[model samples]
Target: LVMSQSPSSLAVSAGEKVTMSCKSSQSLFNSRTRKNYLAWYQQKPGQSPKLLIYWASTRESGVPDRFTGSGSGTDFTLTISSVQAEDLAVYYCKQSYYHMYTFGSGTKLEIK
Candidate 1:
């Protein structure tokens, strides 16, 4: 299944609330596992992508509470309650529901 994200890019100031979107061609929930196969990641320049959320909305250990993941089925979202300089990065959504990992093009976040 194909994954798509939008606005493709964004510019935000620190302390602003930021919301990004991710959508799939089909449902990402796996009935067998009772969990959505969606995940969110953040990649900063010159660094590897870091996992932020998994199972659609479960925040990974050590990730701040300001980051949130929500939605199910073919739709999903990643929200940052408050933007920070450290949060300037490209965000991506990924799915492994079909046992084949597919990633969204990503939403690039820039400091404004």
Candidate 2:
């Protein structure tokens, strides 16, 4: 049930948009609610993880619309547009959709 990303790294121009996807070995399904549980996070250079998306596309409290989540089942995508200095970090997708918790290997978005 381990989730991970591909390419592992990416280069983007400032103010450009970037997408990071996560895939799991197994499907992400919640037996209790019979729903898919997915979340996204952003980890800055020296800061703790920040929640960006949850429940597939629902913006977490104070997150901006620039950060988006989409997809279903065992597949998902996180998109970040208009890269800023603060946006230079590693992004990850997580699934709590099932008993086993999993996270993407993390995609590093760098300014080109």
Candidate 3:
């Protein structure tokens, strides 16, 4: 499946809200499992990518409350509420629905 992520880049200040989009060529939900095969990842400079959200909207165990994921099927969104300096990174959306997982181009978030 193909993935397209947008904005490409975002310059945001602390306490502001930011939203990025991800669209896939196919539905990311697995009807049989009743789960969205979508996931979101964040990669800061010099660090490996880390999973932020999974199952479309469920945040991973220690992710901050400010990070939110929503949407379904071929369209998905990642919203960062009250953006912080430390939140600056490149965000990617991935789908494992086809067994051969693929990721989006990634959205770069920078401090303004």
Candidate 4:
């Protein structure tokens, strides 16, 4: 299944808020398991992707409290409450349901 992240370009200032949307080709929900099985990642320039949030809205351990995730199935969102210099990176959404893994193209956050 293919996925997409919105807005090819984005500019923001320090302390500003930003939101990135992730879309999927199919429903990620499994009624029997009752889980969205979705995850979000952040990748900085030249660095590997890091898990920020997973299972639709749960934040990863040790991740900053400012990073938040919302939504389910085919639609999802990642929102940053306050932008920082280090936050400038691409954010991707991953579907980890039943091993049919897929990642969203991801959105770039630029700090001007």
Task: State how far residue 55 of model 1 sits from its true place (Å).
Answer: 0.2
Best by lDDT: 1
* Per-residue accuracy of model 3 over 1-112 as CA lDDT, tens digit each: 6789999999988899999999988788877988888899999999988999999999999998899999998899999999888898999998888855488999999987
TM-score of each: 0.95, 0.88, 0.94, 0.91
- The 0-to-1 C-alpha lDDT of every candidate, in the order given, reads 0.91, 0.82, 0.91, 0.86
lDDT of 4 at 16: 96
Candidate 1 global TM-score: 0.95
Query: What is the per-residue lDDT of model 1 for residues 54-97, given as tens digits with 9 covering 90 to 100?
Result: 99999999999999999989889999998998998999998988
Q: Which prediction has more favorable lDDT, 1 or 3?
A: 1
Scored by lDDT, model 1 comes in at 0.91
Candidate 1 has its poorest 10 consecutive residues by lDDT at: 92-101
**Candidate 2 residue lDDT tens string, 57-105:** 7889988888988887777888887788888888888787554757778
Best by TM-score: 1
How far does residue 77 in candidate 2 sit from its true spot (Å)?
0.4
Candidate 1 lDDT at 82 equals 89
Query: How many angstroms is residue 55 displaced in model 3 relative to the true structure, after the best TM-score fit?
Result: 0.8
Clash pairs of candidate 1? Answer: none
